[PDB]
Symmetry: C2
Subunit: 311 residues, 2 copies
């Protein structure tokens, strides 16, 4: 029975592992989203954004996916496009790593390398240009605003946490990129299962736009090394209404924490996994949370970060 | 309930995915062993070899693991040693990739870099030297001969295939490194579940020592690029008695096949996964196997091969 018709259907059912060298008496548990078809949390939204676009007729045989990304979402949409028979063009300029170019090329992406000077702005503008060229042939799935992003987390990630913890989860800590994870999970546990948990968004202290927004302060994004989070704006797919707390973490600490997960826990965590753990560790050691079960999303795996400051 | 006490307990429960561009009418299904704590099939034997050595008293608090390896088994034992609180020294010379040195160092391995000239021979000899230095402090777990290797495959991998296929599996195709996978799986399905499947070992045509042995021909190992299989000898953990067929695959075909799995199936397969699939595809297209369910082990994930001919 349990044979997936293609790799997209195999998303999720990722395990919870209790940490030994973080938290207090095992109150911190991590969900290993690296255990996915293309090795990140984004595999879930790659799958669901394609499936939803199919069900609503925005994606059909012959139409071609376009997206300005080279990160986890790009890899996720690439595997799904390959599995389901879509061409996909990802736009990212020329300054991207040879490794990622090779990985996406390996996955069969039509790579369009924009002007380096234009950076993310260049790549986005170029994605938009190709949709323009034939809007009935190209489709941008728009991870930052597409509801199919948080919805998959509400249907899979959140219920998996509920079931795996026998409903004992008290706190969910998740870094925010698109906001889909924390949103979907929070909706599931709070609204579908009815438990009043503490939802904790994590962002870089270098670019704490959620914290600034909620404090009514000037939004001042900044550069940081915590790949995957800290986009420098509030994404539409972050439901601020379900966020109970925002924890800020600095790049150095996130990196050191990822290294500790590897060397001390034997968990091959990515950089943003280090950020989420450091934030969860801080809450875990406040007496208010010490008899509470804290579940932390670890979005990606270490080997995706070999060229990075992680190593 | 489903919270693992450390990362070692989270091994296995890997998914089966049906291939669309290989076999005949979906008769080829792949088991994605890349979905494991340290991202390979070896995570299972890393876990079980440590657990068994604990239960039999050969591994205790304070004793230190030594092993001459830098591959998947090295990474598996590294994560388990980290998770369970053992020092581990891996011996491999100086000519190994910076990436792997960084990955194992990241996992907290005491790296001992032997003479390059001595290669695998050098590293093995050096491992043995350190055991000699204090045999009550050091332990070599010996993946090629330790029964805890095939046993974990008999208890987990094989039953998972049985359950996931509702006992319809007719053929298992697995490349042979230590031989533990094909051995354990075969024992489970044939002896524990009682079904007379066809067990198919896969080896490089460049180094077809199993085929030569069974034909009573001169054993002539040779170099090849199919990392993980083709050790150039018959390992003790290959139970030749349960092998029904041996299929040979060449390096180029294995590599092209891995690239096809990525680009055409959206499966991030490693090199030996390409070898196993090419062999399974050949059987799948013989009329004798065309109404048979073929299950193929995919031992590792693509990103572990970025520095290699795969890309």
């Amino acid at each position: 029975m349990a044979i997936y018709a293609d790799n997209s259907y195999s998303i999720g059912n990722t395990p919870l592992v209790r940490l030994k060298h973080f938290g207090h008496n095992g109150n911190v548990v991590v969900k290993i989203e690296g255990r996915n078809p293309s090795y990140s949390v984004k595999c879930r939204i790659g799958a669901n954004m394609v499936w939803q676009a199919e069900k609503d007729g925005t994606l059909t045989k012959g139409k071609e996916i376009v997206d300005p990304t080279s990160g986890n979402t790009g890899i996720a949409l690439a595997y799904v496009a390959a599995a389901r028979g879509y061409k996909i063009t990802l736009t990212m300029p020329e300054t991207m790593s040879l490794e990622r170019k090779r990985l996406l090329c390996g996955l069969g992406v039509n790579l369009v390398l924009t002007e380096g000077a234009k950076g993310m702005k260049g790549a986005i503008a170029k994605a938009e240009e190709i949709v323009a060229s034939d809007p009935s042939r190209y489709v941008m799935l728009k991870q930052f605003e597409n509801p199919a992003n948080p919805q998959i987390h509400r249907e899979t990630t959140g219920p998996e946490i509920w079931k795996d913890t026998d409903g004992k989860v008290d706190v969910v800590v998740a870094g925010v990129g698109t906001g889909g994870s924390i949103t979907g999970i929070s909706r599931a546990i709070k609204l579908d299962f009815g438990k009043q948990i503490t939802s904790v968004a994590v962002e870089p202290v270098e670019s704490p736009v959620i914290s600034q927004t909620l404090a009514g302060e000037e939004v001042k994004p900044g550069p940081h090394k915590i790949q995957g989070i800290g986009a420098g704006f509030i994404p539409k797919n972050l439901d601020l209404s379900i966020i109970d707390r925002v924890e800020t973490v600095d790049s150095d600490t996130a990196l050191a924490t990822a290294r500790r997960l590897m060397a001390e826990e034997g968990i091959l965590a990515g950089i943003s996994s280090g950020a989420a753990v450091a934030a969860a560790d801080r809450l875990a050691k406040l007496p208010e949370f010490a008899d509470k079960l804290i579940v932390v999303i670890l979005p990606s795996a270490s080997e995706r970060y070999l060229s990075t400051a992680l190593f």
